[PDB]
């Protein structure tokens, strides 16, 4: 077993790919994952990490967050922006939802400390029926489902730090308070990718509160950078956080905030050691039983970078002060001053 760091990847997932076989054309490409694949064996960690077995999602799993007819739509093949491979999607995007269930599995039961799913396409925007933002099926989310229907796990934390905002994944647990979903992501007053995700959406009927929107607005000016993510995890995340006690951990790891993405695809200037500092600070909870998923990032550097900075976190290894601007500020007491009326460490903001 190694109680130690884990790891899923398959190169079946590559196959989700257009047939005209351009990076450009198409922003969500195989070479996401395969260039961090090559960048952990050349860096060692993948030496050090254990490597599980990935499968592919049953439909019987996959309909533990969509609707069938989405399952058998996107699930089984027989015979504008968005592609989608008639021959190897279907089975790419159920390994993706599989190797996460697989690898969080592993790490729940206390098999493995903590692990990275190298997986695509992504899952947070993927809705009971519908698909968006290059996502299909919603990896990160099935795989919290499955660990309450077959694990009895009583609160799990999803924490969202890719910059846009997974409406896939707060739709699936709005009324659930044993799921606690946390995302921060650029918002800009619901006028960026997606749209939604306003700090007001706290939940609803028994889940009354377990939804927390850290959404940045203001713009970028200036951008958002490593000291406003800090202040946000440090004076909102973590302390909701602590208080909620989660016995597991998942995050939907998407790297398009850091450094290099322009103002559709990001617009941030985050770090990818910041990202390694804030998957730290996340293994505190849950007794360090955490998972990270891979959303989005299109710039490889970006995300080969950060990537290679959370998993050495993960392992136990290591590596300034700057005050968060007045749109940070603004934007984090509007969330404080709305979820005072819900958590404890809150109430007096
Ligand atoms: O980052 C993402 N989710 O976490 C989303 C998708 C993406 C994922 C991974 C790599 C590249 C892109 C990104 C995306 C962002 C924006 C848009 C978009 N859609 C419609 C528009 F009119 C304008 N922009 C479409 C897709
Ligand atoms: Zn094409
Ligand atoms: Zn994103």
Redesign the pocket.
């Given at each position: 077993p190694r109680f130690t760091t884990g790891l899923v990847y398959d190169t079946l997932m590559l196959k989700h790919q257009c047939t005209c076989g351009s990076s450009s054309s198409h922003?969500?490409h195989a070479g996401?994952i395969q260039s961090i694949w090559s960048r952990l064996q050349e860096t060692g960690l993948r030496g050090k990490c254990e490597c599980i077995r990935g499968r592919k999602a049953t439909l019987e799993e996959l309909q533990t967050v969509h609707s069938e007819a989405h399952t058998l739509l996107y699930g089984t093949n027989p015979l504008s922006?968005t592609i989608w491979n008639e021959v190897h999607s279907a089975g790419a995007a159920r390994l993706a939802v599989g190797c996460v269930v697989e690898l969080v599995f592993k790490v729940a039961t206390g098999e493995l400390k903590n692990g990275f799913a190298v997986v695509?396409p992504?899952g947070?925007?993927a809705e009971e029926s519908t698909p968006?933002?290059?996502?299909y099926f919603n990896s990160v989310a099935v795989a919290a489902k499955l660990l309450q229907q077959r694990l009895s796990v009583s609160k799990i934390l999803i924490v969202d730090w890719?910059?846009?905002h997974?409406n896939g994944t707060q739709q699936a647990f709005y009324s659930d308070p044993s799921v606690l979903y946390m995302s921060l992501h650029r918002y800009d007053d619901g006028n960026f990718?997606?749209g939604s995700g306003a700090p007001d959406e706290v939940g609803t009927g028994p889940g009354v509160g377990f939804n927390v929107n850290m959404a940045f607005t203001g713009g970028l000016d200036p951008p958002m950078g490593d000291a406003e993510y800090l202040a946000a995890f440090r004076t909102v995340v973590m302390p909701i956080a602590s208080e909620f006690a989660p016995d597991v951990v998942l995050v939907?790891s998407?790297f398009?905030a850091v450094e290099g993405h322009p103002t559709?695809?990001?617009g941030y200037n985050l770090s990818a050691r910041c990202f390694g500092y804030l998957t730290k600070q996340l293994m505190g909870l849950a007794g360090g039983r955490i998972v990270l998923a891979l959303?989005?990032?299109?710039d490889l550097t970006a995300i080969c970078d950060a990537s290679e900075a959370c998993v050495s976190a993960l392992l136990g290894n290591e590596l300034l002060q700057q005050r968060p601007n007045a749109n940070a500020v603004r934007s984090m007491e509007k969330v404080m001053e709305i979820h005072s009326k819900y958590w404890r460490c809150l109430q007096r903001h």
């Amino acid at each position: 077993p190694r109680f130690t760091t884990g790891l899923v990847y398959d190169t079946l997932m590559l196959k989700h790919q257009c047939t005209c076989g351009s990076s450009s054309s198409h922003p969500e490409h195989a070479g996401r994952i395969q260039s961090i694949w090559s960048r952990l064996q050349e860096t060692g960690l993948r030496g050090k990490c254990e490597c599980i077995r990935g499968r592919k999602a049953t439909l019987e799993e996959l309909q533990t967050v969509h609707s069938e007819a989405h399952t058998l739509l996107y699930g089984t093949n027989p015979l504008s922006d968005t592609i989608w491979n008639e021959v190897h999607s279907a089975g790419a995007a159920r390994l993706a939802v599989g190797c996460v269930v697989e690898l969080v599995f592993k790490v729940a039961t206390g098999e493995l400390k903590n692990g990275f799913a190298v997986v695509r396409p992504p899952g947070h925007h993927a809705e009971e029926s519908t698909p968006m933002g290059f996502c299909y099926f919603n990896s990160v989310a099935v795989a919290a489902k499955l660990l309450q229907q077959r694990l009895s796990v009583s609160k799990i934390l999803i924490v969202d730090w890719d910059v846009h905002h997974g409406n896939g994944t707060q739709q699936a647990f709005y009324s659930d308070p044993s799921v606690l979903y946390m995302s921060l992501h650029r918002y800009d007053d619901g006028n960026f990718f997606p749209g939604s995700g306003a700090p007001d959406e706290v939940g609803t009927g028994p889940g009354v509160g377990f939804n927390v929107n850290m959404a940045f607005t203001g713009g970028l000016d200036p951008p958002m950078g490593d000291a406003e993510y800090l202040a946000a995890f440090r004076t909102v995340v973590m302390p909701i956080a602590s208080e909620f006690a989660p016995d597991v951990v998942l995050v939907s790891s998407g790297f398009d905030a850091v450094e290099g993405h322009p103002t559709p695809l990001g617009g941030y200037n985050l770090s990818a050691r910041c990202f390694g500092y804030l998957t730290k600070q996340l293994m505190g909870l849950a007794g360090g039983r955490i998972v990270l998923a891979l959303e989005g990032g299109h710039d490889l550097t970006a995300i080969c970078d950060a990537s290679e900075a959370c998993v050495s976190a993960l392992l136990g290894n290591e590596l300034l002060q700057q005050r968060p601007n007045a749109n940070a500020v603004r934007s984090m007491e509007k969330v404080m001053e709305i979820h005072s009326k819900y958590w404890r460490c809150l109430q007096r903001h």
